[PDB]
Amino acid sequence: PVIQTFVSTPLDHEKRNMLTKVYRIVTDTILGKPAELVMMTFHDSTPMHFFGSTDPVACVRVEALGGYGPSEPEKVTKVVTDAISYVCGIVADRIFVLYFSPLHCGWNGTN
Amino acid sequence: PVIQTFVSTPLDHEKRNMLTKVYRIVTDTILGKPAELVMMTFHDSTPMHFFGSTDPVACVRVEALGGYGPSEPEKVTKVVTDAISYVCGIVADRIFVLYFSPLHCGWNGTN
Amino acid sequence: PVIQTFVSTPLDHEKRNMLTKVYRIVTDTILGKPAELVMMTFHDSTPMHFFGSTDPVACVRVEALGGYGPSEPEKVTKVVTDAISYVCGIVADRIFVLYFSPLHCGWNGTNL
Amino acid sequence: SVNTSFLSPSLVTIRDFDKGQFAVLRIGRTGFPADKGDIDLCLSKMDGVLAAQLYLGNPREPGFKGPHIRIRCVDIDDKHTYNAMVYVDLIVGTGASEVERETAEERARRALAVALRVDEADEHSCVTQFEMKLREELLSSDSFHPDKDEYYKDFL
Amino acid sequence: SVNTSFLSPSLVTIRDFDKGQFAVLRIGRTGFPADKGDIDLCLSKMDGVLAAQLYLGNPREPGFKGPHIRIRCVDIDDKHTYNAMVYVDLIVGTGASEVERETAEERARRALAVALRVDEADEHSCVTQFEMKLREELLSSDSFHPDKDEYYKDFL
Amino acid sequence: SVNTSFLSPSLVTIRDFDKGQFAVLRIGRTGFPADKGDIDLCLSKMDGVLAAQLYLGNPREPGFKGPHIRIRCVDIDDKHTYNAMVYVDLIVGTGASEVERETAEERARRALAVALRVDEADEHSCVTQFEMKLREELLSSDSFHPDKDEYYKDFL
Amino acid sequence: SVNTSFLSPSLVTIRDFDKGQFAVLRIGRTGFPADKGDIDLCLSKMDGVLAAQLYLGNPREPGFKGPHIRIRCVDIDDKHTYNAMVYVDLIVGTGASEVERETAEERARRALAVALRVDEADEHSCVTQFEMKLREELLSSDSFHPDKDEYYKDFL
Amino acid sequence: SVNTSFLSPSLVTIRDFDKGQFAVLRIGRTGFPADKGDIDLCLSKMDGVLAAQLYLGNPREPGFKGPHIRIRCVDIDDKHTYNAMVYVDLIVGTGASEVERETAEERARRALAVALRVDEADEHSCVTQFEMKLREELLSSDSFHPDKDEYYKDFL
Amino acid sequence: SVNTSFLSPSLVTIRDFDKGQFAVLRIGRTGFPADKGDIDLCLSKMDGVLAAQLYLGNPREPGFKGPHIRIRCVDIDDKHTYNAMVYVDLIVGTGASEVERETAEERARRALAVALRVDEADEHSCVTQFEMKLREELLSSDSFHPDKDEYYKDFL
Amino acid sequence: SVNTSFLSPSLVTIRDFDKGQFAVLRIGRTGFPADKGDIDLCLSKMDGVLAAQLYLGNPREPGFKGPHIRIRCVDIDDKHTYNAMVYVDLIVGTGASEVERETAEERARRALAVALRVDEADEHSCVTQFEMKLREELLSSDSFHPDKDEYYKDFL
Amino acid sequence: SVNTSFLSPSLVTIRDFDKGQFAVLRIGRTGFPADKGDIDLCLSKMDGVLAAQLYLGNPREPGFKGPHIRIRCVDIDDKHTYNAMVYVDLIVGTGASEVERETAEERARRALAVALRVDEADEHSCVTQFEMKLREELLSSDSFHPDKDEYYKDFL
Amino acid sequence: SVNTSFLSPSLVTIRDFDKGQFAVLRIGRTGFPADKGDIDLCLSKMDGVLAAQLYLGNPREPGFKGPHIRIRCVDIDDKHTYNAMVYVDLIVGTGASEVERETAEERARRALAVALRVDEADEHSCVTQFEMKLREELLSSDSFHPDKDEYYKDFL
């Protein structure tokens, strides 16, 4: 899968790596996919407006080929929002987590 | 809803705030959703090639859970294109507005 | 169609234009759409982790209104992976190519 | 870029050259002197009217046949709770049909209610109301401008 | 910071946001255009009224019971010798006994006479005179402010 | 060093401290809001009147017996073509011989025509005309100033 | 930031003030001196234990009901192949049901296997194993801290 | 990096070490001197051929079985309208079937038409055409190189 | 300058080379891990013992006949409220009579009560108490030091 | 900006992009290799030809009807004393009478004799000779260029 | 790079990562607090043992058959004169004969006398003596390290 | 300083101004395009010929009676192994005897064998061989140069 992390706060090596390790856990335990097949991109210091203020805010995009399990999105949103809050200090009600499913996914030159 | 604004031109506080108030109007009137519930990201100075030139160009990604009602996307495109043209000086024929609908959306730890 | 290029390596004028010409070829021949209507966005030096390392890695997002033909996504991945490998030096097993189809797409003020 | 002048302690003219606006700030009820927060509040509402205008069309588009939303005055009530009244003009073409005027009328009121944060404390802890005056003008006339000084007589 | 506006060549409004003052500068006798020296002289006298206020009390103290020394206008006579008339308001609470208002008036007159340098020429080479207006207001009223625009009607 | 104030959208006071001038800018015909181009056009014509003044004599010389040329108002017509009317005063000492008045009058018309670029497009693409009011004052009087505010009553 | 102390050549205490952790590094099997690679491996495992905690919950949440995953000791076996044993404590709140206790135990073991990279060579070319000790504590008690020094008696 | 040599006023050799290309620029029809624009156009067409190659495959892939597509000459007609003819070689592996040859030939033509912009005027306001020469080589041979010098004998 | 070592999560040795001090910080009651605030408090209490020493005499004076007041351990109670017990040693000469012994005791108890902020919230919101052990040593002996490690066996 | 190439040790092509010139440098008599002094000498003579052209007319003038003075080759004789033979072309319009062609020929001789410093040793201690070739061309023809490659065939 | 920790006022562990050493500094006779001078003295003696090791062989050579000189403890006597007793271990291979062992002893003892500056005031005004413990270990054993923590039992 | 020109993909002229050399690089056997490595190899062999020259004598010496040893061409065979053939000219004075001639012949070959690293892989993994052409010239003649362009006809 692919996980895009957009935060308005700055990120460094420690914070990006903590989210990386958590994202590996989320894929292996919740998503049932290998932890190494996770592509994670980070976009920090993103100008973001939400709820009438530019206070710290996050938007995490999750893309997984083949959809998600019946109960998997709720478990991902829980762990991701907990991890973003602990790592970035962003409050829970300012953390969006979006779930998409690509039509196809190419890797190593083949789909 | 989530609205990502990608522009090749630089955005300052005034331009981001003007586009911010416009998308709030779009969320409330056309989309029929609370104006405080739309998360809005901005990515200025994006290297963008389109129509054989790097002239000022914009791409806006609109993501709304539950889809869009009839006539709603055409109305959003009209307001967003007018706003981007006024704010950024980008001509209409170089403004893309893409519409998506995620499978699930997380907020405050729950979907 | 819209194509977003996310690479962990730095891109310059030469590299972006090389990928642009390839993307224009991909759209005209494989996707069967005009090459002028392709909007290409580039995002270099992106902090990216994959396969337990931060070694060079690419993620290309393809958005085409109306979906894709029967064998078109396979052909796009082949050309895009080759181009990114040549232009950026990123190995093939560290190049993702995601395909999406927006519900609607507005251009020139009209959502048609 | 923004020219501010005190005609009296509680009467201020604000001319924004870059945004092409003109607004009269007055502290009507109390007559107290206008401070920086009042001017920032007025400039904020002038910004909101520009946003509401974009909901009906791009005014910089050549051959723009309206309609226009133009701010005219911001009347601040600071006796008890911090309140503001925003006077704006809706300008439609002369040959506009009744359905076209009513449509532009309702679209403007919906956009202004969101852009001005009506009936709620906004960024500056100010509860805002607005009053809209409909106008019919010859938009193609060489003597027309959305901010003609005759439109500001009620406030100057 | 300091907003200065020419209502006419001889009539100038000066609004100091940082110091919280409003003053009218007029070249009353001759009607000559106000120059930079005239504006600096007015701002100097506005600063003096601030100092004289501290002789009565600190206006930033919460629940300040007054009295208030507020400058209103600086009328400059530049025909022959350089003269300045400083119009000031003394505001005492309405519940003050007659002795308390005479004491407040004499304390204000003494402080202003020194702060405005009336017994000699100042740094701007100006002979300064001033005139006090005694006012009584309910200082706790929500409709009261020491620089209400009503208090400037004799000069605008 | 130039103080600009909007009394109305179409009425502007411009005070040049360095060049010692006061001018009223008005968009008279249309009542349109004055923009930076209008203020630049006004400041340019104020500059031209200064150049025309030097054709008659240096006003900084001691005991300058005149004549004075003083700009009063710049009235911009922007309805169709870009036009400007420059209202200026010609102040001559009361002891002139009526022949010296017409000599100063003719000299002023010739200098103003060149300095203001009358009946041609200047750098701002403006066709300029002017009107000169003849005045008589005792230039040695302590109650005389070339820009006394009474001279600006027809335009404020 | 990180306070490292050698109690012996093969016994090191590591105090991470910023991450709020304490761990005991010991080179158990061989008794060899701990080098910077061993300390780097230890700090890496403490970082992984911090990530596994986030799979269970955010401990910075007010009124956090648990469970807690806390690292205690990293015992490095470097005799033959490079191996590490990570001793951790799982702390569930008092009164936890048998289901809550078993659910917390399995969610912990699954997250710890990924975060610590068990049975596979990690970035430091080390095969990591872990051992989990279950504890129950009244988390709202003033005498509770997830890193009480009594929890470390087995390794000090 | 890029080695440019004038064999004559109208005959230029361009060697790109970084991109690994060699190309002959000639102003064929007119024999005019090549200016920087002609050289920039040639480099742009050289860049397009590189892009068209990637549509067929990555030539840096070990054991690359082709097909190769290599620019040889850019011939510019600048007599009337600005035109360019791009001579390229299509090198397929020896023993290619008829369908493999034709498939590789059509794929190269399609990719080149876009990359060289044969349809319209390009960024340099040039109408581009190309002519493709098919070659078959044993790609794994020690005596094979895509830019062997004899491939340029028709243009030097 | 200051060498800090964690013998356990709740037992810290602090060695101040520049001030010639040694103190044992321990979180006795709760056994919680010593954080940066706890160490800063210990260094603050060590600082107060130095100040209390100067009330008795300058120790750096050659041939200092004492008495010495030397900090030994700071035991922090952070269960409910924030408290600290400061164990200090009072060292007097062997030849000191019983009158000089108690006079030194109370002179040092007075100084310690002030410098350590006894029975009140100090800079770190900590309520401090102290406990004093009296020692008799031949100060001129070559085997005497104010901070002999035997003096710390109660806390290590 | 200047592209120099060695076709042989003594044969050098010099392309000046900024000045729009092409020249062949040859050390003809001795066949010695060209050094930087030879190239600098050639560039100086190419510069002198530009100056001599300006004696006949500005070639950047639109519709320039000639005549043209174009340098072709600089042949350096360095056997004994340092000598240079400068081959230039004189291009007159095809519709020129015998008188006009002889006048342009004499004018070009006088100017080139001064600009090339044929009388004395120049800045590089080089006695300069030159040889003109008269050419007649239709200057409005689309196939004409002052430096067409055929004009250099005698030197390449 | 050098981790220094106080187990007691007179007991310090010193771990040099860059030089792969571990030494125990103790103020044995007096028990006085170790100051910066004692630690520098200990690091200087750790340097000498490293130099003496190089007199016997380069320990970084692959397949190093020894012997090893390893510092263990520096015991400082500062009661009267400034002395230090250095405890080192001489590790020879198990398969070495007696004559090989006693030769390795003499080569190391003679080298240590120069490196540690025995029986003379060194750079720190310290009279140094050393004590050597002979060990025999299979240097190819996977459970062998020249600084095994068991080699430090007598001093920790 | 070093002017490189491609006459063809496999034919390069290299002109070293500072070292006063001219060499022809050709990728003879294969016709492959000369890359930066081939050019670096050519510059290395040009250095070696210059180093072998100094073994025979300093050519900058006034009145240098030879012998000269000049590089003419480096022919690279890069088909299978990496090989190079270096063509050099040995120029002796015409007045030299056959003994002096063959002695300079043997000395040059001895020096070239070391300088060019013949029959062994060099810094660029190239096995080098050379071919020496003996020439006799009147070294004081005005028409002599060691790199006369006639000497290169076999390679251009």
XYZ file of C-alpha atoms in Angstrom, chain H residues 60-123:
64
model
C 21.040 0.946 -19.451
C 19.361 -2.353 -18.571
C 22.036 -5.087 -18.682
C 21.645 -7.417 -21.637
C 19.434 -4.838 -23.366
C 18.007 -6.614 -26.418
C 17.043 -3.314 -28.034
C 15.707 -1.852 -30.158
C 18.053 1.152 -30.118
C 17.071 4.488 -31.625
C 19.913 6.949 -32.152
C 20.009 10.449 -33.593
C 22.508 10.976 -36.409
C 21.908 14.348 -38.067
C 19.722 17.439 -37.746
C 19.405 19.163 -41.135
C 17.895 22.652 -40.904
C 16.112 24.395 -43.777
C 15.990 28.114 -42.931
C 15.489 29.542 -46.440
C 11.827 30.469 -45.973
C 10.023 28.913 -43.016
C 12.110 27.386 -40.233
C 12.296 23.616 -40.768
C 14.387 20.685 -39.562
C 14.868 17.116 -40.792
C 16.057 14.677 -38.115
C 17.942 11.599 -39.322
C 17.742 8.726 -36.825
C 18.702 5.055 -36.892
C 16.510 2.230 -35.596
C 18.776 -0.641 -34.536
C 16.956 -3.909 -33.862
C 18.587 -7.167 -32.851
C 19.821 -9.338 -35.697
C 17.438 -12.061 -36.816
C 14.295 -10.074 -36.039
C 11.111 -11.492 -37.521
C 9.117 -9.459 -40.020
C 6.460 -8.626 -37.425
C 9.054 -7.765 -34.767
C 10.815 -5.461 -37.231
C 7.563 -3.770 -38.251
C 6.323 -3.551 -34.654
C 9.576 -1.945 -33.500
C 9.482 0.319 -36.559
C 5.949 1.579 -35.884
C 6.605 2.061 -32.162
C 9.680 4.170 -32.917
C 7.782 6.259 -35.479
C 4.943 6.964 -33.036
C 7.287 7.844 -30.169
C 9.423 10.066 -32.405
C 6.421 11.950 -33.805
C 5.519 13.136 -30.301
C 9.053 13.572 -28.960
C 10.274 15.529 -31.995
C 6.934 17.396 -32.317
C 6.460 16.789 -36.032
C 2.849 17.992 -35.932
C 3.247 21.688 -35.073
C 5.920 24.307 -34.449
C 7.935 23.363 -31.373
C 9.371 25.546 -28.607
